[PDB]
Amino acid sequence: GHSYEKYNNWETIEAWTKQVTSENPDLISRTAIGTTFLGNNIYLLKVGKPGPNKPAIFMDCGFHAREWISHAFCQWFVREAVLTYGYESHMTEFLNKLDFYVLPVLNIDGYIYTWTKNRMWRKTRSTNAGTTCIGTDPNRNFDAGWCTTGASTDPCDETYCGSAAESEKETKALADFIRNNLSSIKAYLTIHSYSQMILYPYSYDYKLPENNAELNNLAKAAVKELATLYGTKYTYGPGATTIYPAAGGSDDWAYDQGIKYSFTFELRDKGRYGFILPESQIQATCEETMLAIKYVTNYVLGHL
Numbered sequence: 001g002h003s004y005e006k007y008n009n010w011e012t013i014e015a016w017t018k019q020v021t022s023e024n025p026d027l028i029s030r031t032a033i034g035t036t037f038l039g040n041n042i043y044l045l046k047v048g049k050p051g052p053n054k055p056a057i058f059m060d061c062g063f064h065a066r067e068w069i070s071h072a073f074c075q076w077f078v079r080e081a082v083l084t085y086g087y088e089s090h091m092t093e094f095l096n097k098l099d100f101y102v103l104p105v106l107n108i109d110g111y112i113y114t115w116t117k118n119r120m121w122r123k124t125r126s127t128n129a130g131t132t133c134i135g136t137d138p139n140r141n142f143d144a145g146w147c148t149t150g151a152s153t154d155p156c157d158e159t160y161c162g163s164a165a166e167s168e169k170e171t172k173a174l175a176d177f178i179r180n181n182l183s184s185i186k187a188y189l190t191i192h193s194y195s196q197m198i199l200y201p202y203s204y205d206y207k208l209p210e211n212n213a214e215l216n217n218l219a220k221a222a223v224k225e226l227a228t229l230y231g232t233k234y235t236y237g238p239g240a241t242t243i244y245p246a247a248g249g250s251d252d253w254a255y256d257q258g259i260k261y262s263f264t265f266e267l268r269d270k271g272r273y274g275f276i277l278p279e280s281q282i283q284a285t286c287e288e289t290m291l292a293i294k295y296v297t298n299y300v301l302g303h304l
């Protein structure tokens, strides 16, 4: 049984992607953008009412296997879209005028592993030459100052950058999709946990994006909007100085492709539960995060 207020295993999420699509044909279509190391289909939902020359926002969850609230949020976003379309003015305008690409779980193999073997697994489940240590950090595997800072060259490490940029089937699939759709995708949003932050480029070097003032102001306003619901306090800024320097991130890579609105969300909490955020917090976390995501979406729509 699927529930939006519990953490769902991969079999359940996969079945949900099929069911939510079948139940909402006028608003949702599903494709597979590739396969994981272990051969699992990487599903992508396109959410929106069909129309001509629509701009798009791309959102992914589940880069890091143990960050279960991330996976839960992508599902919640789709929940909100199908529930409130036609009833709530903003969501209806969003879905009429733009498409949302929602990738519910990128690192499917790692996610399965957190359910079956090791709740605290982070990386992919691919093999590495010359060692029995498993996995690459998908958010150190993109072609963005690749493997230079905040990333490890040791395959046994949690931030292992991989053998080469896009060495992982999952990151290659994501990068390929974005490159193939670069004329339509106007914003890139990537959902992580934890630490309550909205980050934007750059993480791979201490340098700032050309539109730094715009991104800073947008992140500041989105943080303020998020806080209105339950008073949850987020920080924001360029990745390198807000959390830490880290090379090979998808947000930096997306920005360097020309996607001007590129953000990483780090959801609840600030360390009390960390990655093992209780199910009792899914609803509140997702509802407040919705406010930030809708704020960014409205901004993108209004500044095309």
Ligand SMILES: [Zn+2]
Pocket (backbone or CB within 6 Å): 002, 003, 004, 016
């Ligand atoms: Zn359900």
Ligand SMILES: [Zn+2]
Pocket (backbone or CB within 6 Å): 014, 040, 041
């Ligand atoms: Zn399957």
Ligand SMILES: [Zn+2]
Pocket (backbone or CB within 6 Å): 063, 064, 067, 192, 193
């Ligand atoms: Zn993460």
Ligand SMILES: [Zn+2]
Pocket (backbone or CB within 6 Å): 192, 193, 194, 266
């Ligand atoms: Zn993180």
Ligand SMILES: [Zn+2]
Pocket (backbone or CB within 6 Å): 080, 287
């Ligand atoms: Zn709601």
